[model samples]
Target: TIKEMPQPKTFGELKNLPLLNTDKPVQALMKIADELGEIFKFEAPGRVTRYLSSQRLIKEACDESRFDKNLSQALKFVRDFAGDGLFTSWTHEKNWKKAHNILLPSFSQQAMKGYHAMMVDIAVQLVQKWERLNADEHIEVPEDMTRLTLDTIGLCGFNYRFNSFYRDQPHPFITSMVRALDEAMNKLQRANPDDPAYDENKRQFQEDIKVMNDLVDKIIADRKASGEQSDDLLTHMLNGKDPETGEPLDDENIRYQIITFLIAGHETTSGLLSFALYFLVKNPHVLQKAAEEAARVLVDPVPSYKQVKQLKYVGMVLNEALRLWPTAPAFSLYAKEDTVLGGEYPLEKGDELMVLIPQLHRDKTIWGDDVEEFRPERFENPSAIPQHAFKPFGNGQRACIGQQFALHEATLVLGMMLKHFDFEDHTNYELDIKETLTLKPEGFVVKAKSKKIPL
Candidate 1:
């Protein structure tokens, strides 16, 4: 196979690679991978953890038509992330089929319509909070983005309200989940845990997960005993029928769904708005573009669900932000069987491949010379990138189910902020990201003033 498709030359080791801004990766991706050809192979410090980075190969592997979910049963790493849930289950066709069957309809456009009011209300809470801030007080924009998404998920997804913005401090429910989510991300970034270095954190992480799981269980029990059919994600999920089996998902599988929704959707959604606002603040011209468009589409105080799409530049701004900084910047999938990738080397089962989104999304080769420019206009007309190039939510079959939900929610958040607040960039502030499975900013100081309407 090497004769047919030669392997990409080695890029040395992953740890050795330069990550320009130690905290933020956008600059580093532009610096390090700019010249690296597509499909570079790298070994982690340990030979045990080798990987392939390829846009073309990943697109091919994730393509359901070309390959049946090229995920290896040999991957313990994937299991460590999602355990035995729907997000992890897709590797096995049977497990994937059973759960995906019921959940598929939950992410439809109709389903997003059902969730829009909750999303809008949550964004309004953040907007209203800004009114109470003193003129000189720096609004922690990143933290508010975190609040908006979590509260939206709680109300829209489960019909529960964390009331995130109402309380400056997290309610106990949010606190427990926060610790657990933080611990989970810590566990991931730290990697190997058999050593004594990890014992304390490992125990703490386990305890936090138990708290989150117990909370989800209690809510489920409460809903079931009450015999109430609410118009929320949980109700939609409970309403689904398994075509193969007459029985519905049992309590444990339902809990797994809850956990997956919390872990999988929350951070990414938060980061999307957080990064978009960061870009708008840094690039003031872009902020005006968003404001002008938000003004046009939002003649009414509350923009309708149908009208969210009409804010074309707002959507463009969000898309461009996603391109520059995807919440989950890298995606890695393992080979399920002996597979021929890139018409090159035949990979053994369990071979890992990473889809480096930041690198690929900003590839000057694919995206012309001005790839780094913050021009949302590139998206105004289609054909900006080649067919499979742009993958903020990923490409192919296992792509994000909540993509539409996330987009609508973020669009509203960005539009409302642009329409109401004017931001000043902090010269002293470096992006200073907090690294995790998904990136989080330490916090951003928004020097924002109200943009009043002349009634």
Candidate 2:
């Protein structure tokens, strides 16, 4: 069954031409994968990148024994800002192992229980703000969700507060971080080194990096000086030691880990909530059902941890949104040795394959023809999905460490919003996703009218 990878055209024929639309490549990739088969390749100067877009192929690629996380060019560029942080570090890197183990306990179920109140604290800020907005004024969905998530992570992760809801404009930290990330992605997209504007953009990117670093550095220094003990990520990084090596993370490494959490923690979850809103708004029936589930479970003003879990239908909605638009869209892996992929394609030790999560989630063989439709009920029977087929979070050891944390927070926010407000798609805005380091429903807006409380 051995055969060549199906490509759009031969490498020599295409010859370093743009393979996908640069601005919105994931969407472009999805279209290309639909036309091509599950596995396809695109060769570019000195390198060949392959993509796996179906459950059948992705399942074989998920075997940890056969493949390891690969830092593709995009990730390598991200390392300029993130350094050896958990998300960007190589699979075998010692710091990745050390930091990962040290931080693992912070995301445990018990840990989530402790972070619940702080999560509620931020979710309240969002609801309160929406309640106060003028009745007809449409709220920008991504802007508000981003603020909610940033404040939650800042407070719960380190006891710091960006206090995003308190102000009209985003915190300076957010502005700078977004600019830097935008530049990084766009640089790969269309930046030209010789262009007169390139140097200015590079200067701005570096300055933004410094801005982010200074804020994180101050947080670390203030904690070191305060000599206080608390059960947060900062405290863990500051005092926690590697159980195996008995080593503490160095000051520089701790800074990188903090930045890693801030970026990875908030942005992906922000996108999750935004996309969930898009789905809920698009399907009014689903929204009403979710609100009914919220009303039944969230009896208290702010939901208790147990009550949050009881919002089962809301959870299904979030799962369905992730299936459609996984916030962190794709992850890349390389083979450990010679292997046959999908029982046909030959994968060598150096062959890097990017698992396109969006396309994999839409694999018709597993999800059926209605894959494009927004149906939360598909998740009602969780076991129905074949293993490794619906990976919103990346796979294996590199799987998102914050899965529980994100789900709990997302459930809380979605539940509270449903309980407190009735949303309307004011703009009739079509779903337009903007891709930076993550995916968000760009320019999507809605109106959240306050609903009367049940006496």
Candidate 3:
């Protein structure tokens, strides 16, 4: 009943096919899903090559691989067994469970309480920055938001002072980390599976990996040698042992996981904030409603975490922003064996199954005629759409481990931002969505002006 269909060459054919298994990255497949269809599958080179080529797949692969405990061994395993298919069946099940058990609980309301003070501090600093700007001005909000989110993650996740926000330029570690990720992403686009360039790209990727690995090693070594335990995720991770394996996560494995969260977590919320501000500026009614809600709910100068929920318009704005510009554009899975999907298509073993979240989120059939419009009201009732249709973080067993983290971070940042300033778009400036490991803007520029509120 199952036979290999003619492999789709371009993204169009790949998208149109009910079942697709071409040797390409997830983003390529996602871009074509609109004209083709909603669900499809494709193949890509394993961890060593796939992410380098298509950075967007990093989230899907990592989400699928969360429980592998031994990331270095897992990387090697992907390289060996799956070939170009970096994400395997083990990741789909085991990694997901490990991540869920170990990481998810930390994002609970109780744990997130620790982050509130840090958020207030950062928000105050941002307000000060706005005051220093003076008068009606247009400032790049993306860079500002990126710094804010990074600061929040560092303070809340690592309990370290990265000071990325205060520096005139990005800190060395932050700059190097971003550079390494960018370089790795670029190499993926240039390198072909069977070419000399591919080998060169691999070497370059290793170099970048080394840079990050070295930094992580230094941090772990310093902490371990000092025997200093702080209230950061790193501390919990280092101390946490797998009940089944009776093993603690090694430094390298912890490093990749940290890097994964740092990179995946910040840019997404930063972009969402940027887009939210852009839309708020574009839509005066939405902006007024949000500001009014903030004013009404948070009578005090600063709002607490509990008050954040009262700002219903704020939630809508965020939902609309996520719907329009998802941090991770799509979701991916690998077929464990020959199987039928949706009872219509046959999937061969090792086939890479993917769902374009962006395309699917925007699908007219599922989202109705107003799919493209930025209306947060659609989510107010919560029962209007099917659960599977809207997954900015993703769905099934392999959903994002850091979903709560991302949500909390976004809420805090947006709450702080809306309280202090009103934003406007830069003249003739449009958002340029850069397709890297995550969906982020190219220049990170957003024009904003401080809102005049009664003290």
Candidate 4:
């Protein structure tokens, strides 16, 4: 029906197309056809924008040097969301390239294994906490995930300690980080308006930013004053250099990258953990099958790197969970030159395009009618999925740098979890989702148990 529909000739006419018009602004993205063509255009406020949801087109947009992160221009408030550094502001050629080069090595395979060792230790800490709880007492999954991942960042990324599990109260950095992220994303959604709330939001954002920055700054200064160094990302930045100029990256610029990792590292993985657990308990047969694999493979409550690989089914379940509830749900790019995209749509200069991930992942034609159902077996034969159909991570050169690290961390954490307890839904827990840059499950809680009182 859409193909036979007349294509809009002007930017102003684009939004009038069926399935494009909306009464609400952002949720306009929420309503879309099961399959849009390789490229389509819609009017977004003063501009005609292109949306590329198909596999080939999204891949092309992500091609090296073809597009820039100019959608960031709409998100000035959350520039700090990426640690408020050169992140949302950095260009492909200059600051972004320089930072990418210096930070790439720290994300290597061995580094992930090193990260996993710290991860396993922390997973044990979570289990110890859970083990102490009385039967039917639910653990706040997101709260625990956030705490665990932050602590993992501290230990894995900078060799510091958050003492998240040991603390009777949330750490100061954790509290400030929570508020900073909430306000930053709200600013983007609400457009950082100059109305009454803007100044107050600005003040709160700045105060929280100072708190977190002070924490990292103190770590850097402490490391320097004591000649303290460890095999972690912080140590690398202190001594690392720019490839083009050969000058060492100074502390301030490197600090943004560090905090960016800290924020990105925790939230996305926490979302992954929360949703994967949600789906597991919701689907009983699959949950048991996953537990069966974990019990067979795991020799200890905290499995090592090689042991995690042995639980093949657990990986399949995680992939399916990622597919349905991707943490970073969407990406946007801008065209710098006049170019045709998807071989049909002629894009004028300065057109912005979005790859709406949640829409694409749930498309009925590509994923079939069971699109909403939780099925891990769909991934057992991955050959059936079209190339870009399952991009939980972003596509191409701009794809997530920490892809392996996320997978390793998730797999180990889930494996350790299954080994330690039987996860069950809280009787009154209801599903509530909220998005702040990444899609997160709000109020999703679970309780754990040993099969027979640790006989």
Candidate 5:
């Protein structure tokens, strides 16, 4: 613990903090955090929110006794469409508890093993698609990354097929989902209602939500009508009961749950894969080293689930990328009662608290001077890193449930891509991000030379 610093009372006093821009709000806020120390406060008359970046302070904040996941204003906007889905649900809601308990088993080791075939199938489609591309052709990496994850989650989560690779563009449900999420973010940004297109935008947002809801409804109906009893999430939702309440999820709850999985399951994973590819391409030494590991371990055309775990270097590379650029960059916590943070800063009841992950991940005390470098070895001895120092997924009980599913899918695909292709950035593009509900490298393009065509 450390002594408390004086809180800045006016915007003028906080001149060092960057003026936040809506286009890349988190990125701008990250610079502000770097200027501030471990902890700092921002007040706008009626509102006060504090951020914690150092591992020490984050460890204190992560104490479940002190703080819980706060579904702040933006998430409330998400709830307008998601409707108490797992990610948007209030911490105390019964639905969250019910869904958490009922679905927790789906992401278990055995469950991932069960889903491995579908993950492989979807990843193979990407590999095959890239194989067909001429050696000199430039590939839009994020587009394929998105297709791979969306299709994987669709197939494994519910036995539904997005068939994202088969089409020229994304599926209709994905189109609507992305548009609805963009509308939600735009609303959070407080776009001017006086603009001529504002009403039309809202109309489209509403329509998009309907389209997603109807599709999810049809998925559930189709599954039920077929009398199919495959061990997918839909079946789990249909048959599994909440142990505490002895209740099954209602059709509406199942609909929300499916939509939640469809959105939550793929978005961050796609970003993770995309960012990893960017980092790999940016650092050729690391790329060659990681690719060597892939070539060594993934000797077969398709790796078994056990072999996926054998990808030590590839896994470390993914971990390092997550440290540098967490797809879901920040998460909020709230104190229900008055509390002291880090045994120093006094926090009021209901004060908004945020953990800025990029700041924490690069904290000098933990990562040393070369935190800026693309060094995967930092994660080689994961136990050596301090607790709460590298939480790309999230914190405590509210952490992402799909962590294993995401990691498994990403590691397998990344290994396969590295082993088969030699990627080069023909345009020498800088890392430009497209941030929505998650973050992905914007307009990132790469050309591949297939080293060994498995087919």
Candidate 6:
């Protein structure tokens, strides 16, 4: 009778199932919904275990390995260990601290001042492109946003010049990295651990990784060889010693961290900016609120960090977008040993637990009847959200290292964009939800219009 019953496709079905009566199972199910959305459910425990275990091992190796000290060795490291671990584990505590402490704070106020200057330079470039296009001409906002984000990350995070915005010949690394990630996700989806197809997929992924690693390796080596130091993340990572261990991050670790940031930072932020704009155009009231907030606090030529703090509604809108379409929708954690999770489900050793943010955001039980609506007011009270139900950057020790950076970048970029432009939906293009390491809108598109400012 249990086998004969219809299988659960979405998170709601899995949550309401009779077999999952225990609190732990229910919590686990909810976590799965938070990460994976409603497409498919994890049925086999062994498969989940294998995947998570591999992830933990890879993260640990990356943390402990000193192979990154040399650029050449770092390149080899990525080739040797591209996708052996789970995607979620890639953002572990050690790796996060390595970037956040050593790398993130490397930039001074002056550097950020310069970085903002560059953003304005790029914005002018975009406005020119938009002016050239006819009113009826539809343009892909996501593509433009992607370029902006890549260029921003290059300038701010690495102090490099990608000049990706509207440039005919952008960095090959950008294209190569995106392709490798897509292929890696496909391989993970198609091939089982033991299958020959899996081996082939792994090989392809490693090759792509080699290209990325090699590029980063060259940058690091050149900088070190020239004895040049700057207020960028990479410089701090290469020079700064770990507080706890007194050991400096080697080239391999730096490569992993940089690549990790490049992938996680650019893809997530660009998609987020696109979706936020998408919602803003669809809902004028929200857009007005964002504009009012920006105008009130961000009267300066460029948005400051202090000004960003005042744009509460902007933050809420971004949160709502992330709720509906999380960049990294699902996160997985392995049960270190036999432990009771959420005080109900009996999680045995090596059990992999996934937390699904999208389902959690839309859950009527927690978020009221209007859970589907893009309402920023939901976050106004803060306490309205239940504990553990809303984790965009995740929770505990493994939360995103670049959470602050992403937030700052998004708010600043949005503030700058909203000051001059009004977004409009182009071709009613439906969002094809593609679940890779992150939740991406396949064929994401939109249009821009200049805002009418009163003289």
Per-model TM-score on C-alpha atoms: 0.87, 0.96, 0.79, 0.87, 0.94, 0.76
Give the residue spans of candidate 2 off by over 4 A: 9-17, 191-196
Give per-residue CA lDDT, model 1, range 1-455, as digits (tens): 47333232344554543332154443444344545555554434553222333456555766553444333322234344345566656546565666677777888777777787788888778888886788688888667887788888788777888787878897675676666655554443354568898788667666766776688788888988887897687886677777886557767777777766766556888888888888877787888878998888877777788888788898888888888777777655666677777787577776666567777776665667887777788788776556667787865667777788888888888888888878887555678777655776666676778887421
Model 1 stretches with alpha carbons more than 4 Å out: 1-32, 44-55, 65-82, 188-192, 426-428, 453-455
Residues 1-455, candidate 2: write the lDDT tens digits: 89887777543644433755377888888888889979888776567888889898899889999999999777887788888988899878999999888988888878898899899899988888887897598888898999998888888878888988888877888888878778767766562466887888888889988998999888889899999877578888898899988998988888888787788765899999999999999999999999999998988876899999899999999999999999999999999999988778887788899999999998889989899999999998878888898899898989988899999999999999899989989888988888888999999999888896631
Per-residue error for 373 in candidate 6, Å, reads 0.5
lDDT value, candidate 1, whole model: 0.69
lDDT by residue (tens digit), candidate 6, 1-455? 11111234433433333333332332344444444433233443224221111221223212212111111111223334332111222434354455445544544343454455555555555556665678777666777777877776776656777777647655888777876766644433242456875676667666776788788888888888988877567766777886765677767777766677677756788788888887787788999889888777777655565776678888898988997777765555555566543232454665554444566566666677887788988888887655556767765545665677677678777876677666666676676654545555667666677664321
Instruction: Report the lDDT of model 3 for residue 303.
Output: 70
List the global CA lDDT of all models. Answer: 0.69, 0.87, 0.59, 0.72, 0.85, 0.60
> Candidate 4, which segments miss by more than 4 Å at Cα?
1-28, 32-48, 71-75, 81-89, 167-169, 452-455
Worst 10 residues of 6 by lDDT: 64-73
Write model 3 residue lDDT over 1-455, tens digit each, in one string: 54333333334433323222322344455555543453333333342111111213222333333212122222332232122111222444444345445665666767766667776676676667776775555566777877777777766666656676577797665665676555544544442456875676457556655665677668778878888887677788777876655666656556656666566545777778877877777777888888777667876777777876677778778888888777766544554556554444564555554445566566676667987777778788778665455678755455665666667667766766777766666575666666655666566444556666633
Task: Look at candidate 4 and tell me the lDDT of residue 226.
Answer: 82
Scored by lDDT, the top model is 2
Which is the leading candidate under TM-score? Answer: 2
Candidate 2 TM-score, C-alpha based: 0.96
Q: RMSD (Cα, Å) of candidate 2?
A: 1.8
Model 2 alpha-carbon miss at residue 39, Å: 1.0
lDDT of 4 by residue, 1-455 (tens): 11322233343443444333222323345443333444555653445556555566676776545666664433455566444343454454465667677777778766676677787778778878888898777888988887788788778778888898888677887777778877765543363278885887778778888988898888888887888778778888887887876776677766676677777766888899888888998998998998888888886545878887787888998888887878787777777787766565566667677777766677666788998899999888888877678877876656677777778888888887887788778665676766765777888888888653231
lDDT of 5 by residue, 1-455 (tens): 64656344355643433344267877867776777778887654345678778999999888888889998566777787788789889779999999999989988767899899899998889989998997588888888898899888888878888998888767899999888888776765563556886888878888999998898888889888988997578888998999999998898988888888788755799899999999999999999999999989888878899989999999999999999999998889999789988778878878778888888998988999999999999887878888899999898789998899999999999999998999998999889987788888999999999997583
Candidate number with the higher TM-score (4 or 6) = 4
